[PDB]
Design a protein around this ligand. Structure first.
Ligand SMILES: CC(C)CCC[C@@H](C)[C@H]1CC[C@H]2[C@@H]3CC=C4C[C@@H](OS(=O)(=O)O)CC[C@]4(C)[C@H]3CC[C@]12C
Ligand SMILES: CC(C)CCC[C@@H](C)[C@H]1CC[C@H]2[C@@H]3CC=C4C[C@@H](OS(=O)(=O)O)CC[C@]4(C)[C@H]3CC[C@]12C
Lengths: 107, 33, 287, 113, 123, 246, 120, 29
């Protein structure tokens, strides 16, 4: 017994046949009718555990679902040579000020 | 509204360095005259 | 269950045709009907046993056959403009014991006198207005497909390379341009309503798609224009924001800042090389 | 068809660029400019080129049970390193340029004399 | 409850079924058996892990279960639903991390200049 | 069997009826045909009584020689054509002609207006649009011969739990304006005709903003170049104070 | 053998097929016949003025006169985006701007150095 | 404000206001 997740235009919804019991995670927003729960936009990563109750000869059973997204908005692509380049130029600049001071600091 | 790694807090900080420099030179210029 | 082939079909006066009906649930006896505006369903032929076929109520011009216990094809001997209808196929087990029929999906035919009347549609997309966005905070797109004959299209909506089914409404029946004439063309429309903050992204892709069924690769064409065959016709639009600050312009700002700070960094390295060399020359001259 | 069975599958949410080969087989093989670049079984029917911002080019083939296909040449140019020339761009450029050469020139004048 | 554990590093996703400590663990994805049959060299199975190398976002994204060997698969009552964007050589930052790196860099440079200043006056 | 539409409010009880005078039949059934589809069997009976399938219930009168059907808690998911059927123990099930049925929704908060949609720049038409009504409103066709009007339909957007009514008008000829368009129909008083004085809110546009990975990387490289300018400029101050101080 | 050659300048895309030496060239775009009698065909080129991304994008093919298009040699696919008064930035155009700017402002400082030397 | 033009114009003013100060801080000293 699955709990169906549906993705409309830019949102995530949780659809069941009776009211949804929250457990932990994203709180969400009840819509105008009961038995549907709106979790917001997909790029803001909704995560949680939810729980419903049955009818429709799955009647007198119970299940649970867990939602997990990783829409990778605050990520940065980088190669393992670029970090060597960046750290090398920073070290050269701090040593360039380090030589830069005491040519002045003798006079 | 997802800014990710484009917050304006980074650019305003890096201007804050320059701001500290201007404050110190005003302080020494007062404490001479 | 019961299947049939083709879906739509165009044929000219005096041109025979054979259309199928297949069945796999081990029933034995089948039928053919035709449905009309104002007349209802009417029987054509049936066959209670494999080899024995009977007549019906309007059988004038339709031949049948029965080879196996699963196929039951239908043939037209020629064409007439009175043959334009929708044809269905039925199925039952054995002879009045359990009265359940099972119909197929159907087949449309039009019959013309001449093939120089067949045209493909023309699709165009109309973007939403700003009075609706500032008043109700929702946005509606309108897709028109005009000027086609015969009436054998199917319409769909594809937002970001996938179909949608929610928030869409199409007309049930296509309208006519002049309802006074005999050989007149058609028109048809559809809607997509969307929240306002989804339309305002400049990264979203919207399109309308129409599937047309026409001629094929067997027919003479003495006309100047292109031979109207089976194709898809479509029309696109990007979402767009009119006032304000999007992520179309943030790229502009960041590019110009990178190029200027590189230029300044080059000038400063030149000056550092200069005064370093000058202090080297004075250092040589101290001794 | 005429041995044309490489097609491009575009306009996804992410900027992914995908190829789909039309053969009624399994264990589809891919190529590029004549040499092998891939090998792919069922449950994955689509080769991946990456983002469209890197704007790939080249020539691609696929074969299953029978002989090779005729090629397809891809060519994206989706410019994205482009600056438009406004009043704001040229004004900011000239302003930074003048004030930099001025400050450096004042410094050199005080060094020499 | 006891949640799953989903760990994504590069283009490799590792799931963790937590429920049974003393059993063998089987897996299933959109009602098709995955792993444990020596097809899919990219897909490996372990004692209570599942390795998914070269993860695809469009394909291979949906429901995942875990059920013990010797039970029916359609008698489960706790499922997972994942979608994830992956690409190679792609780390996940924060915002406060960048400020710690910038302020720490400025403090190290200031420390070096104070030290070399007073050591220079003692010479 | 009675033809013609019957328009029913949402959430009611529907009554249909067919007459078969005069014969003696046994097998009774009903078929439901949507638009541009094939039929589909709903209810199957050959005795007097009541065989429910949920919200569907039929009643058969053997000597009164008519059948019926009742639907309760009616939805907009029921608008179709309904064919009643009967037969002997032989073949040739004999059919009626069916009865077009329409159900209209609940329309909580109206706000009627006539809008002008932005043009296409690939065809030379213009379109107006007259949206949500309160479902009592009738829409009549054009009096002219170059102004095409559609009929009204309902759409359902499940991402906000909302529904509506629409009608679209278009034309080629000039002197076509969205104040003259739906003139042939009756209208609700206090519709909304917009002014050309545009209004574009800005704090609404900012709730739809994205981020790539390339924008993240380009912004970080800017933050690197600023620190490089500060260190090199500090070196230049120290050297020129060395040469000017002596 | 030899692929197509795409040449973009401004709001103009011009593309050449130097595959067949001598014949009459017939172009076709999304299974629609193009070229001949905005859009203009030369004797060996094909020029496409005032380009729009959503309109002209997809399968182009040239094939000899009197043949079938299902036998040509292979199809192209272009998906481009053009601009008017835009300039694109290489790793070499950046290099020429930096080196030209350095070599200009490396002489003015010597002019102020010599004028400022022979003042005092 | 999101538009980073205000941050860059904030940098130049605080950048050209440092030279004048230093220059006038050595004219007296
Ligand atoms: C050495 C000293 C004089 C430094 C001066 C720094 C200023 C003059 C430069 C550095 C960075 C520059 C900005 C970078 C970024 C932009 C965006 C651009 O707007 S755009 O979106 O139309 O491209 C307009 C120029 C502008 C405002 C530049 C102005 C000029 C600008 C502030
Ligand atoms: C790329 C550019 C914007 C960076 C500029 C960094 C240096 C090269 C500039 C910035 C500010 C400039 C100083 C301002 C003005 C002075 C005062 C002057 O003092 S004087 O003592 O000898 O009376 C010495 C030169 C000096 C320090 C200038 C040198 C040159 C100077 C250090």
């Amino acid at each position: 017994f699955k709990i169906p997740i549906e993705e409309l235009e830019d949102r995530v919804f949780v659809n069941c046949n009776t009211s949804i019991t929250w457990v932990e995670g994203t709180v969400g927003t009840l819509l105008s009718d009961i038995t549907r729960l709106d979790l917001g936009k997909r790029i803001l990563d909704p995560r949680g555990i939810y729980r419903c109750n049955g009818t429709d000869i799955y009647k007198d059973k119970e299940s649970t679902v867990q939602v997990h997204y990783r829409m990778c908005q605050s990520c940065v692509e980088l190669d393992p040579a670029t970090v060597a380049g960046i750290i090398v130029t920073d070290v050269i600049a701090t040593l360039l000020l380090a030589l830069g001071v005491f040519c002045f600091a003798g006079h | 509204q997802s800014f990710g790694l484009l917050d304006p807090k980074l650019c305003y900080l890096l201007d804050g360095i320059l701001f500290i420099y201007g404050v110190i030179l005003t302080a020494l210029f007062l404490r001479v005259k | 269950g019961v299947t049939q082939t083709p879906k739509f079909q165009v044929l000219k006066t005096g041109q025979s045709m054979t259309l199928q009906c297949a069945q796999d649930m081990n029933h034995e006896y089948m039928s053919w009907y035709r449905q009309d505006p104002g007349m209802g369903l009417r029987l054509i032929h049936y066959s209670v046993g494999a080899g024995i076929t009977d007549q019906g109520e309007v059988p004038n011009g339709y031949n049948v056959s029965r080879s196996t216990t699963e196929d039951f094809p239908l043939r037209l001997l020629s064409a007439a403009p009175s043959q334009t209808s929708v044809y269905f196929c039925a199925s039952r087990r054995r002879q009045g014991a359990s009265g359940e029929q099972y119909f197929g999906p159907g087949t449309r035919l039009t019959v013309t006198e001449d093939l120089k009347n067949v045209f493909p549609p023309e699709v165009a997309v109309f973007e939403p207005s700003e009075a609706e966005i500032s008043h109700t905070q929702k946005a509606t797109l309108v897709c028109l497909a005009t000027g086609f004959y015969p009436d054998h299209v199917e319409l769909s909506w594809w937002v970001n390379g996938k179909e949608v089914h929610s928030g869409v409404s199409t007309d049930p029946q296509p309208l006519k341009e002049q309802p006074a004439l005999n050989d007149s063309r058609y028109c048809l429309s559809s809607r997509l309503r969307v929240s306002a903050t989804f339309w305002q992204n400049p990264r979203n892709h919207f399109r309308c798609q129409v599937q047309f069924y026409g001629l094929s690769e067997n027919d003479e064409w003495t006309q100047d224009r292109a031979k109207p065959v089976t194709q898809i016709v479509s029309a696109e639009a990007w979402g767009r924001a009119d006032c304000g600050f999007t992520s179309e312009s943030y790229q502009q700002g960041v590019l110009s800042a990178t190029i200027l700070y590189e230029i300044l960094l080059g000038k400063a390295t030149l000056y550092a090389v200069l005064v370093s060399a000058l202090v080297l020359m004075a250092m040589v001259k101290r001794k | 068809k005429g041995n044309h069975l490489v097609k491009v599958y575009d306009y996804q949410e992410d900027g992914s660029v995908l190829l789909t080969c039309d053969a009624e087989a399994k264990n589809i093989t891919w190529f590029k400019d004549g040499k092998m670049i891939g090998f792919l079984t069922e449950d994955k029917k689509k080769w991946n080129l990456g983002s469209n911002a890197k704007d790939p080019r080249g020539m691609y083939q696929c074969k299953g049970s029978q002989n090779k296909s005729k090629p397809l040449q891809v060519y994206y140019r989706m410019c994205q390193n482009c600056i438009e020339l406004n009043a704001a761009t040229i004004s900011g450029f000239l302003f930074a340029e003048i004030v930099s050469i001025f400050v450096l020139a004042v410094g050199v004048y005080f060094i020499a004399g | 409850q006891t949640p799953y554990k989903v760990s994504i590093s590069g283009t490799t996703v590792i799931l963790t079924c937590p429920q049974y400590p003393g059993s063998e663990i089987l897996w299933q994805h959109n009602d098709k058996n995955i792993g444990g049959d020596e097809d899919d060299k990219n897909i490996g199975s372990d004692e209570d892990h599942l390795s998914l190398k070269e993860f695809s976002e469009l394909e291979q994204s949906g429901y995942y279960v875990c059920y013990p060997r010797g039970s029916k698969p359609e008698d489960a009552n706790f499922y997972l639903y994942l979608r994830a964007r992956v690409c190679e050589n792609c780390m996940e930052m924060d915002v406060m991390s960048v400020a710690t790196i910038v302020i720490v860099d400025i403090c190290i440079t200031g420390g070096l200049l104070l030290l070399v200043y007073y050591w220079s006056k003692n010479r | 069997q009675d033809p013609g539409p019957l328009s029913v409010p949402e959430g009611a009880i529907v009554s249909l009826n067919c007459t078969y005078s005069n014969s003696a039949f046994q097998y009774f059934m009903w078929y439901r045909q949507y638009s541009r589809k094939g039929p589909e069997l709903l209810m199957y009976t050959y005795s007097s009584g009541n065989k429910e399938d949920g919200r569907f219930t039929a009643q058969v009168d053997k000597s009164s020689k008519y059948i019926s059907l009742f639907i309760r808690d009616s939805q907009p998911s029921d608008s179709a054509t309904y064919l009643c059927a009967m037969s002997k123990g032989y073949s040739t099930l004999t059919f009626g002609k069916g009865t077009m049925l329409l159900v209209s929704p609940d329309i909580q908060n109206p706000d009627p207006a006539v809008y002008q949609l932005r043009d296409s720049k690939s065809s030379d038409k213009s379109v107006c649009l007259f949206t949500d009504f309160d479902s009592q409103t009738n829409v009549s066709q054009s009096k002219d011969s170059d102004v095409y009007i559609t009929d009204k339909t309902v759409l359902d957007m499940r991402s906000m739990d909302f529904k509506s009514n629409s009608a679209v008008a278009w034309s080629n000829k000039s002197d076509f304006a969205c104040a003259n368009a739906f003139n042939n129909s009756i209208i609700p008083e206090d519709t909304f005709f917009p002014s050309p004085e545009s209004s574009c809110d800005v704090k609404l546009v900012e709730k739809s903003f994205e981020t790539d990975t390339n924008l993240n990387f380009q912004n970080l490289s800017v933050i690197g170049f600023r620190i490089l300018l500060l260190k090199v400029a500090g070196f230049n101050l120290l050297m020129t104070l060395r040469l000017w101080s002596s």
